[PDB]
Design an enzyme around this catalytic site. Structure first.
Site, PDB file in Angstrom:
ATOM      1  N   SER A 197     -67.170 -13.031  59.300  1.00 41.13           N
ATOM      2  CA  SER A 197     -65.670 -12.399  59.201  1.00 41.13           C
ATOM      3  C   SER A 197     -64.780 -12.832  60.295  1.00 41.13           C
ATOM      4  CB  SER A 197     -65.930 -10.747  58.715  1.00 41.13           C
ATOM      5  OG  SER A 197     -64.911 -10.081  59.222  1.00 41.13           O
ATOM      6  N   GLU A 324     -67.763 -10.861  48.209  1.00 46.38           N
ATOM      7  CA  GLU A 324     -66.976 -10.250  49.531  1.00 46.38           C
ATOM      8  C   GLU A 324     -66.085  -9.526  49.425  1.00 46.38           C
ATOM      9  OE1 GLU A 324     -67.626 -11.839  52.467  1.00 46.38           O
ATOM     10  OE2 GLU A 324     -68.477 -13.938  52.035  1.00 46.38           O
ATOM     11  N   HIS A 437     -69.920  -8.266  51.592  1.00 45.00           N
ATOM     12  CA  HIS A 437     -69.332  -8.748  52.744  1.00 45.00           C
ATOM     13  C   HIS A 437     -70.165  -8.263  53.964  1.00 45.00           C
ATOM     14  CE1 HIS A 437     -66.129 -10.397  55.214  1.00 45.00           C
ATOM     15  NE2 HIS A 437     -65.759  -9.229  55.534  1.00 45.00           N
TER      16      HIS A 437
END
Ligand SMILES: COc1cc(CNC(=O)Cc2ccc(CNc3c4c(nc5cc(Cl)ccc35)C[C@H]3CC(C)=C[C@@H]4C3)cc2)ccc1O
Lengths: 532, 532
Positions: A197, A324, A437
């Site tokens: 991320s 995600e 995610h």
């Protein structure tokens, strides 16, 4: 002796830690910077002044000042991400896991946590490096960096709050590794930085920044890339947001000197408590204080540097997760719930895409809606739920990363692309959220090797395939062991654009990951927004 | 006696015609208007002044002056559409087939030929009405109207060339039917107008025009509708094209009257030879001289009339073919050939989209391109060919008609929607062109009932279903016979939007005909072009 290591800054004493049925050395909470406290808040970090004596490094350091998620108190699925240590502005420390016995010159991997640039800790359970260091015989480093306003308030022109100091925090940790990793058995000429991320975008940002390129060998990017829409801002927007941060705290707003002085008087939680009031729009997957395009750390716009080849030429291994976007719809979109299937109505769907593409005009919203709506079945709560998820993940992660990977491959020296689409046998989140995610981190870090964590046999095997890909890539620039009898992860090229799935099944090779939606996101939609 | 008929304008002598294994009556080439020649060129038609004696009506009339397709000379597939009689400005005649013996009061169907408003004849083989008059016991009329500049040159304000006189030619024939069809056994209170291509749009335009609504009962529209983009123009664009037709032939352009006088001196083929030179763009499926939104035939904009409900409220039966666009790609797009499979390269595809959406800017073209390209397979010549085919058919016929169908059903009294997708077992055109623009007419007119034409036993049954649908609908407003245990063609409603296929297989009911692509053509693209 094995645990006592003399660094260019001072002596450090680590601790023996058990790992599966053996042991390795851990050096926890080593300082690499001077604490950015008092008048040093919003500052470029300064190198840690050398210390006399022996630094006790057997305990995790503090966590930087950050927002704390309290949506599901007691829920392990959300709290596994929160600071598990006391928070402090004195947080610039790094951790190292060294195999025992200590290698001579072994490959080094440097973990960079993500968290929207407003949160993240090096000390979380899922980032524990003992399984990776021990299984792949690497020296594993996890760094830290200031998040939120403390690391990314940007008043360009001021040398006092210049912006991007959290990125300079990571740069200086990597300088430390460059200067000291040899004393731990690490080879500074073979350092792999990797992150997920915001960590992944950070990794890509060091690929771009000239002042960073020479501080690592190659790069791994997970669910993030420097060109992401949530990953940077103009100096004008970053200024506007800092000025607005002061207005929320009754700060004097006439000079940066006054604004900076006011914000230095505030307790950390005072800044955190109003941190989100500064965003321009009602949005999901958008964060207040992020890197700035400043003509310094980034010489020009991210896109011009990508076009010109102005970046580090090396090898990269990168990828994304299947869903995600689900984590963000749960927290910020109407109709989503942890405890239901979250079938989404038409009214909710429209609100969803509004909150997902907050910069788009009314025409752009029609465009998104049309590209993701099956008008034979538009009241289908499930297609509407799954459509909104794809919108979020394509716009924010997948298509930004795919644009990065195509641009980079034209100049780089080796690209490997993955698609992580395994849902953990023990996920605590509902099935509609898919492959979430950040939930590939547990496999990168080998947690499925711990029998008490209740992963399946096949997941232990998948986590070992992944750890070995990552390590072999860090050691050689290629995830594959040549001459081995295993299925080979193929290179991503400009013409064939190959990539693999990561999951419990034998490997499959595909081409043009989400090409259809990403043509929309990367070429048509910006052309429609530029026009209108 | 059966062939001698007295009309309000004079006596007419028909002829006894064979059909299959029987005979019926036929009255060919009956005048309904004064010959629009000389000083009457471009003018509103005048009623045909009564004659003494007996009009010989055993012979097809002249065809109107029109472009003649000579691409494939001798080829039956293109020459079946060309004038099969002498061309002349004295062409305002109509034909009547009457069952034998003559019925008392029977339903009347009036055919209105298509052809882009620049060509078309009442006398073609596929329009020969004996089979439909005989098999369904209807009185069948085929009218004629002026085409090209002769029918649709428009200098709004002038009464010498006001525009739409071709539509007014159609109106006058309908008026003649209202005044005389009773003498041939036809009930003027149960007249159904129907036509294909420009004829289908014409039917729609008579539904809209107040001065036409009382001259017929119900309507059938095939592969055409009044709101099609090729089907009308503003007064400004009509005047522009008229002035340019003048400039093309060195006419005095000072005044409407000097311009009109100049053009009336020109020979017919002089006008035709430069007809195409007035179009604003390089285009396909665009025609120079077409109806005008003038304020008199059409009181206001077609959309406002569709929105306010300002039209004739009755029953409509209407539909489209599967591959409306292939005929136009054959004739005007690069890479298409009568004799190959016409796999289309990416460059020819791009050139097609431009010729197909000539009014679009660059953002419009990217939108069309994105919407019809499979970016997993963009160098597939078949997929590119079929995409271009769908672009032409959807933008020009299918989506224009579905917008009409939806708007009309809100105020009408019964909609019936078909999708004709059978490809004739004896087509002389290559397989890639599919179900062609025009090639449902043969089944409507029962040409498959002729054994010498070498159709299949199942195509003759399809043609009989279609004829009975059409005639039953004309007789009753419902294509279904009551209390029959055949599958029932469902009414098209605002919310369920059902329609049927017409082919050799047993009927199936579908919903939302090409709704995905037509949301783009009816709602998104116009919005994008209006915004850019
Ligand atoms: C830029 O593109 C160009 C476009 C053109 C346009 N071509 C023409 O006008 C030639 C032409 C061709 C055909 C007709 C009449 N024939 C047909 C007709 C119909 N379908 C046909 C299908 C095929 Cl496969 C072949 C002919 C059909 C269906 C009806 C509607 C029209 C417009 C004409 C009739 C009757 C009239 C005129 C010429 C050159 C170009 O370069």
């Amino acid at each position: 002796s094995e645990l006592l290591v003399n660094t260019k800054s001072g002596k450090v004493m680590g601790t023996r830690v058990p790992v599966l049925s053996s042991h390795i050395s851990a050096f926890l909470g080593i300082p690499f910077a001077e604490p950015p406290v008092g008048n040093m808040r919003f500052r470029r970090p300064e190198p840690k002044k050398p210390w006399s004596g022996v630094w006790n490094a057997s305990t995790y350091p503090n966590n930087c000042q950050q927002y704390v998620d309290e949506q599901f108190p007691g829920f392990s699925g959300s709290e596994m991400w929160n600071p598990n240590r006391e928070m402090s502005e004195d947080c610039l420390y790094l951790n190292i896991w060294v195999p025992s016995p200590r290698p001579k010159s072994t490959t080094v991997m440097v973990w960079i946590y993500g968290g929207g640039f407003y949160s993240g800790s090096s000390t979380l359970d899922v980032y524990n490096g003992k399984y990776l260091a021990y299984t792949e015989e690497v020296v594993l480093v996890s760094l830290s960096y200031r998040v939120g306003a403390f690391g990314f308030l940007a008043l360009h022109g001021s040398q006092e709050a210049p912006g991007n100091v959290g990125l300079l925090d990571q740069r200086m940790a990597l300088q430390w590794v460059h200067d000291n990793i040899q004393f731990f058995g690490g080879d500074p000429k073979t350092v792999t930085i990797f992150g997920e991320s915001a960590g992944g975008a950070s990794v890509g940002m060091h690929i771009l920044s000239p002042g960073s390129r020479d501080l690592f060998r190659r790069a791994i990017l997970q669910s993030g890339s420097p060109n992401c829409p949530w990953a940077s801002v103009s100096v004008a927007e970053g200024r506007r947001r800092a000025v607005e941060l002061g207005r929320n705290l009754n700060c004097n707003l006439n000079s940066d000197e006054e604004l900076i002085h006011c914000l230095r008087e505030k307790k950390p939680q005072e800044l955190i408590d109003v941190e989100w009031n500064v965003l321009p729009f009602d949005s999901i997957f958008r964060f207040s204080f992020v890197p700035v395009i400043d003509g310094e750390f980034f010489p020009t716009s991210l896109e011009s540097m990508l076009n010109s080849g102005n970046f580090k030429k090396t090898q990269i291994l990168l990828g994304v997760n299947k869903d995600e976007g689900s984590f963000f719809l749960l927290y910020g979109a109407p109709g989503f719930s942890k405890d239901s299937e979250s079938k989404i109505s038409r009214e909710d769907f429209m609100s969803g895409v509004k909150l997902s593409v907050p910069h788009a005009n009314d025409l752009g919203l029609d465009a998104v809606t049309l590209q993701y709506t099956d008008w034979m079945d538009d009241n289908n709560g499930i297609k509407n739920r799954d459509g909104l998820d794809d919108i979020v993940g394509d716009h924010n992660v997948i298509c930004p990363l795919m644009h990065f990977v195509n641009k980079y491959t034209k100049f780089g020296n080796g690209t490997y692309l993955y698609f992580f689409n395994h849902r953990a046998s023990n996920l605590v989140w509902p099935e509609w959220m898919g492959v979430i995610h950040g939930y590939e981190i547990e496999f990168v870090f080998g947690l499925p090797l711990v029998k008490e964590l209740n992963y399946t046999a096949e997941e232990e095997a998948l986590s070992r395939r992944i750890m070995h890909y990552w390590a072999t890539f860090a050691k050689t620039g290629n995830p594959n062991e040549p001459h081995s009898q295993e299925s080979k992860w193929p290179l991503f090229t400009t013409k064939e654009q190959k990539f693999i799935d990561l999951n419990t099944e034998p490997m499959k090779v595909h081409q043009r990951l989400r090409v259809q939606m990403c043509v929309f996101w990367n070429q048509f939609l910006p052309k429609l927004l530029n026009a209108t």
